[PDB]
Amino acid sequence: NRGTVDFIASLENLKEGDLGILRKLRGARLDEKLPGFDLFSALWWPLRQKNQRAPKREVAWLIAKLFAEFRFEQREGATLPILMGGICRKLEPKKELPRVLARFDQLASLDIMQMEEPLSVIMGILRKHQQVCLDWVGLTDVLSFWEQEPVKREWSDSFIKAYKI
Amino acid sequence: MLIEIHMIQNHSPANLNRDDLGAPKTCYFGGVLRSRISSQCIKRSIRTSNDFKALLGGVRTRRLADLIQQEAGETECWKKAQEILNKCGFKNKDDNTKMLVFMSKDKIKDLARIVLDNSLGLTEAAQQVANVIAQATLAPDIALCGRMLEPNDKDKDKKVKWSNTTVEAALQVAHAISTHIARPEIDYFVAADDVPGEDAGAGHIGESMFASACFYKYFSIDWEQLVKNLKGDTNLAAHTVGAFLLAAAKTNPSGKQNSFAAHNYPDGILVEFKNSPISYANAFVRPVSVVKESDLVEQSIGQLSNYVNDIRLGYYDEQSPVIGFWFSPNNRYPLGYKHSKLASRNIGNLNELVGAVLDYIGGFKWEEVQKSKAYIG
Amino acid sequence: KYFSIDWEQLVKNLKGDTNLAAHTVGAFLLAAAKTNPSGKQNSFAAHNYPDGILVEFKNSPISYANAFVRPVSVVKESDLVEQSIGQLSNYVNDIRLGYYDEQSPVIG
Amino acid sequence: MLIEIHMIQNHSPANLNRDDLGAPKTCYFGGVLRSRISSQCIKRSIRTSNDFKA
Amino acid sequence: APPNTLFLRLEGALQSWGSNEAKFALRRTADAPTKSGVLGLLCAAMGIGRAEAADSWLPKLANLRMGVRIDRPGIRWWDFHTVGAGQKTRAETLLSRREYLADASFLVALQGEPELVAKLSAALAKPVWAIYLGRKSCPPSRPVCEHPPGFYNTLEEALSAVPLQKRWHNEPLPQILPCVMDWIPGYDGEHAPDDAEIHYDLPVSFQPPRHLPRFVIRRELVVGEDVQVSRETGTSVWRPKGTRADYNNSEYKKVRAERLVMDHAACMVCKAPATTVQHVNYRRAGGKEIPEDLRALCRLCHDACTMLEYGSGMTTNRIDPCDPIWRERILAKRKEIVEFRSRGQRFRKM
RNA sequence: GUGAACCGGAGAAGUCAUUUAAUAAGGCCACUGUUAAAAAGUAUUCCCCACGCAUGUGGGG
Ligand SMILES: [Zn+2]
């Protein structure tokens, strides 16, 4: 896609003031506070009116908030299941590993509205283990096409491939 | 004539039914994962409650000899009671335990008076207790759930004659399914030592599992089968129907309730009289999803009303219509979105709903059918 | 579910009572739509109704079982029933594009 | 003349046909397993019915 | 040229061609259609009963050479079939098991006299009686009269002029297609060969059913050299349309201006110079919309409308500003925007 | 009318009981938004229609 790449580049073009504006609004909707709505509209609407396959409003809002609180540099080949597999194959397999596995597996039963907080938990686990990179574009596409079966199959397959190295 | 009850309920975070692994019971419906309460849980939790106390005329146990022994006040005949029961046909499964027998609490006196009699033999004693067991099918709970008792025969010496021990059921309870997708969660607990001085440290994180859901519940009672099951008692059948409706409205399965305490109430009860049974579970093949402003219960009731209207307009026949009443607590949740009303009545009190149901069924009154009292104990 | 009825065989079975044959066809059309198997319905109570019935008249027999050679996968803005009906519609469209005309139009 | 009837019917969690073991009856089509209600079960329900007796 | 051979396609979800080893309760398919099986299908096509077929119609029909090509060789599935005696008189229940071939396809070629083949093909286009595959609980999934006849040659040549149909994109295929053919006389190899098996599928009579042995030979075929792989037609996987609206193609850019002239440059609810257009019904987008689907609005009112439908879960029927039920919420959102907006932020972002 | 036709694997069942994730932490040190303007002493006001045509009067968007 190209709307996603432009959206991510625009998000990384922000400075500390607008990042703080987005950071103050975690856990909130889009139609609540005017400064957040204005910032997100001015960042997203030209891309939507240009590219027909730009990310939807809810997905783009969720990625904007996650980037605000969990600022990671954009890199290719650093998807969420790969990093979760790399982290998960370092703990004992009796107590901690089933807990982290259950936390990762909760995401399959949630829709796109109720997914900011588990993703925040996963990214907090990533940040606790000295991670400084993430693939925002691939995560945005996966969240955009989520209720399908092949996307979840590829998600779990990438997790298994990272876990069984 | 069939009386059907469709209920919408929403429950607090709890665990009302678990499998062997402890996780809450789930199922698959519409290609997505729901949450399930098994039908044998609903039936047991309804029939064992403070609202069904007067009609608990049945018992289900393997220790019938213990019932015979406790029915008397002497040293009794406990060993030869078990020998007689072995002669009956309730053989030990792999030389262990017994077979489940459903029987009325009334006819145990005949068992006590027959087994203790010394003017007979073991074979005649076994035949007599078999005969009196086969004629213990007069109880409100046995008239709904139904019975099927069949010995394995491995111990049938062609000396004990058996009879029609099967009772056709009158009540068909469906498995309760959630109206939305299922979101199970894990509660993490640590048991704390009361002594302040531990001098030790080790992780002992436990694992408990729970979930919260909006359940759709479906029941069905065959009126003509209940008359035949109760041999022709209209008053007892009406009392059982009313008490079952009142119990099902205000009871919950007593699962992990001392730690979760999720005694919630239904937000909608639709009672319909029909000629052929119909289930509205197809309303929720599309799962209910929350929006910017919505109750989960309001959206579920709206979907139910949409599908009910579609079925009524689609499967319509003037030879046998359907008339139904819709009950909500003080009309909190109307059937729909204040549009396309279908229900012939809008009750706002549960007692009035049960009274109207009994009035349509036989013209009885709820204060009138309470005189038909079964075994209480 | 698929059903077929032979009109000539039924008429020969009734030896000419065409009104009785039509009444039996109507009775079966009602019954096969509002009857369910009795297996374990006292514990599960799956008294559901058809979500769409298609009656067709043609010379050769056929069954639209090849429509669901790909298992139906559910998406966000659909349910299982609508997708099954959509696959049936696509197969009917393809059949009427391929097998039609020859002085024999089909009726749905 | 050959009248053909096609139906699509979604069912609640149930067990309408059984093997000698107790599982629901299945079949194979398209590379997966599919739940199946047998032909002779459906014909027995349509026959001997109160609708077909009235 | 007069036709010589006739083609039959036998394919269904379930099918079963019984064999002689089915004697008491267990009924087994062999592997493939038999001669006696297909010559009951042809007999039921021309409406010949069980009687009157043995003396006249069967001897002429049995004088044929037929061969079966197998694709999707089928997976045998067993069925626990109970017959209730009673419901002599007893409450007993008889048990049996029946075998079916699941997901199978067979191509049968029958070669013989020209006018007999023409009569058979004319009968198959509109059969007199119901046509099934072995047992009456197994209807075909593809038409039996699907391939045209012709003046072909011996059965190996007749089993090569039919393409191998596929169903979806990643449909796995076999490299080898086994085929089963009737043995052929000719007085050079007058004795039966070593690799010939014996099948009991030569029909003589049907009501007191009578079958005779028939020598059967087996051969093979390879895809790409004898049969060319075809392709499926139509669309299998069904998806909702769900056209995401586009604001860059020419058709929408002209429809929007047409709507902006239909309403005389005035916002609908607040009656200010309109600068944008908001959709109501979304099931026409992508460049096919009509001017009646669109409503003119200004910046403040369209921002309020966008706020009012962010997470409301509206798929096709969005907010209609001309509706007098949405007036209060739009006015309240407009008041909030007027009270709390900052022009400096928007001017700085662009 | 096809080892085929005719054909229910059916009746039945609470997984219930017990449990704090607890004890602790400053996000700290530095930064002009600067340089500019008559809503008015003009020389064509962006379009249509009544009249006789001395840098002409009336009427309507
Ligand atoms: Zn406006």
Q: Which helix (H) or strand (E) holds E212?
A: strand E210-222
How far is B36 from B19, CA to CA, in rounded Å? 11
Which nucleotide has the shortest C1'-to-CA distance from B37?
Answer: F14
Contact between E138 and D38 under an 8 Å Cβ cutoff? The reply is no
Contact between B15 and B255 under an 8 Å Cβ cutoff? The reply is yes
As a rounded value in angstroms, the CA-to-C1' distance for B60 and F58 is 110
Instruction: For residue A11, give Cα distances in angstroms to A72, A142, B62.
Output: 11, 18, 70
Ranges of beta strands (E only) in chain B are: 2-10, 26-29, 32-37, 58-61, 101-104, 176-178, 185-187, 208-210, 214-222, 268-274, 323-327, 345-347
d(CA E78, nearest CA chain B) in Å: 26
How far is B101 from B111, CA to CA, in rounded Å? 14
Contact between B139 and B375 under an 8 Å Cβ cutoff? The reply is yes
Contact between E214 and E177 under an 8 Å Cβ cutoff? The reply is no
Task: Report chain B residues whose CB lies below 8 A from the CB of E240.
Answer: none
Instruction: For residue A70, give Cα distances in angstroms to A64, A127, A133, A134.
Output: 10, 8, 10, 10
* Nearest-Cα residue of chain C relative to residue E144: C60
Number of H helices, E strands in chain C: 3, 2
How far is E12 from C84, CA to CA, in rounded Å? 19
Give residue for tokens 């089933």: A98
Task: Quote the distance between the C-alpha of residue B352 and its chain's center.
Answer: 23
Contact between B73 and B136 under an 8 Å Cβ cutoff? The reply is no
Contact between B366 and B354 under an 8 Å Cβ cutoff? The reply is yes
Contact between B155 and B89 under an 8 Å Cβ cutoff? The reply is yes
Task: Report chain C residues whose CB lies below 8 A from the CB of B7.
Answer: none
**A35: which DSSP letter?**
H
Q: Is E298 annotated as a binding residue?
A: yes
The answer to whether the Cβ–Cβ distance between D12 and B174 falls below 8 Å is yes
How far is B190 from B186, CA to CA, in rounded Å? 13
As a rounded value in angstroms, the CA-to-C1' distance for B100 and F12 is 9
Give the mutation candidate from C28, C49, C59 for the D interface (greatest D CB count, under 10 A). Answer: C28
Give the mutation candidate from C36, C40, C42 for the B interface (greatest B CB count, under 10 A). Answer: C42
How far is A132 from C21, CA to CA, in rounded Å? 78
The beta-carbon neighbor of C61 closest among E125, E139, E240 is: E139
Q: Which helix (H) or strand (E) holds E213?
A: strand E210-222
The answer to whether the Cβ–Cβ distance between B286 and C79 falls below 8 Å is yes
The answer to whether the Cβ–Cβ distance between D5 and C55 falls below 8 Å is yes
Give the mutation candidate from C2, C8, C9, C70 for the E interface (greatest E CB count, under 10 A). Answer: C70
Q: Which nucleotides of F are covered by protein (CB under 7 A)?
A: 1-22
Q: Is E301 annotated as a binding residue?
A: yes
Helix (H, G, I), strand (E, B) or coil at C85: helix
Instruction: For residue D36, give Cα distances in angstroms to A1, C36, D16, E104.
Output: 43, 14, 9, 17
Decide if E135 touches C, using CB distance below 8 A: no
Task: Report chain A residues whose CB lies below 8 A from the CB of E169.
Answer: none
**Torsion region of B139: left, alpha or beta (phi above 0 gives left; psi -120 to 50 gives alpha):** beta
B-C interface: how many C-beta pairs under 8 angstroms? Answer: 53
Chain D contacts in chain B segment 241-280 (CB below 8 A): 276, 279
Instruction: For residue B133, give Cα distances in angstroms to B90, B93, B105.
Output: 12, 20, 11
As a rounded value in angstroms, the CA-to-C1' distance for C92 and F56 is 81
Residue E30 backbone phi and psi in degrees, to 5: -85, -80
Instruction: For residue D1, give Cα distances in angstroms to A18, C29, C106.
Output: 74, 17, 12
Chains A and D touch (3+ CB pairs under 8 A): no
Task: Quote the distance between the C-alpha of residue B59 and its chain's center.
Answer: 14
Tokens coding E252: 């929408």
Helix (H, G, I), strand (E, B) or coil at B32: strand
Q: Is E267 annotated as a binding residue?
A: no
Q: How far is the CA of E313 from the centre of ligand 1 (A)?
A: 24
Q: Label residue E65 exposed, middle or buried (CB < 10 Å: 0-12, 13-18, 19+).
A: middle
Instruction: For residue C89, give Cα distances in angstroms to B61, C73, C94, C108, E53.
Output: 55, 16, 9, 12, 42
Tokens coding B124: 């005649």
Give residue for tokens 């979500």: C51
As a rounded value in angstroms, the CA-to-C1' distance for A41 and F38 is 39
As a rounded value in angstroms, the CA-to-C1' distance for B122 and F12 is 29
Angle at the Cα of A144 from the Cα atoms of A138 and A149, rounded to 5 degrees: 90
* Nearest-Cα residue of chain E relative to residue A14: E349
Chain B contacts in chain C segment 69-98 (CB below 8 A): 72-74, 78-81
Strand E65-84 versus strand E93-111 pairing type: antiparallel
Tokens coding B188: 């993490």
**D49: which DSSP letter?**
-
The answer to whether the Cβ–Cβ distance between E240 and C65 falls below 8 Å is no
Contact between A46 and A2 under an 8 Å Cβ cutoff? The reply is no
Helix (H, G, I), strand (E, B) or coil at B57: coil
